[PDB]
Ligand SMILES: CCOc1ccc2nc(S(N)(=O)=O)sc2c1
């Protein structure tokens with residue numbers, strides 16, 4: 057099975073998922089001086105006022121908060137997108153130390169963690185159909201830096217003990233993902249891929265310029281999760297991030313000057 061360990065980590069993924077060496081892989085380093093400002097880009101439109109969270113799950117390589125996506129409750133529109141994208145889940149990537157953890161980097165700077173809000177294009181009817189299409193997903197990426205606490209993240213931090221090992225889930229209702237957004241919605245965008253297997257090249261990435269702050273205590277609680285299932289040898293869930301991949305024939309666009 058693939059993972060983030062020495063014997064099954066990202067450098068090995070291509071043997072089972074040859075698209076790992078593809079032309080539009082993620083994540084990438086965002087070179088701020090080379091990104092192109094595009095005044096054609098629209099502001100993002102984040103519509104999360106009716107979101108309905110359902111569950112939180114330790115999937116063995118991250119934890120994810122899942123949402124009801126059977127109706128246009130929580131949607132993303134605008135920016136570089138065409139059409140309406142529904143929120144299905146968010147999850148994080150983080151490090152063993154505060155100096156690493158994010159997937160995207162900015163001028164080679166790593167952040168302590170990265171939040172992915174994953175949305176699928178409703179014109180494809182369901183998420184499994186959307187990931188086979190080059191415009192099927194839109195992922196909102198938010199960097200986390202260590203500093204002050206993020207009050208809106210604490211309900212998540214508080215339930216992690218319940219889902220410590222792989223395959224455990226818990227009811228997680230009435231969570232409002234608006235409390236995870238930064239103040240500004242300025243962004244970079246490029247065409248890319250899922251950053252875990254199957255690494256499909258179906259994602260429009262929208263990476264926010266402004267990080268959110270979280271406290272050292274909040275991130276430390278992430279690092280107490282386990283990659284293993286209950287009853288198995290304890291392996292702490294840390295450094296579940298992929299390297300920056302080559303940009304190849306892609307242009308990163310910025311919504312801001
Ligand atoms: C297709 C089975 O579900 C998947 C698989 C990988 C995957 N990676 C991301 S990420 N890290 O946001 O690029 S969301 C996601 C959903």
Ligand SMILES: [Zn+2]
Pocket residue numbers: 147148149172251
């Ligand atoms: Zn992710």
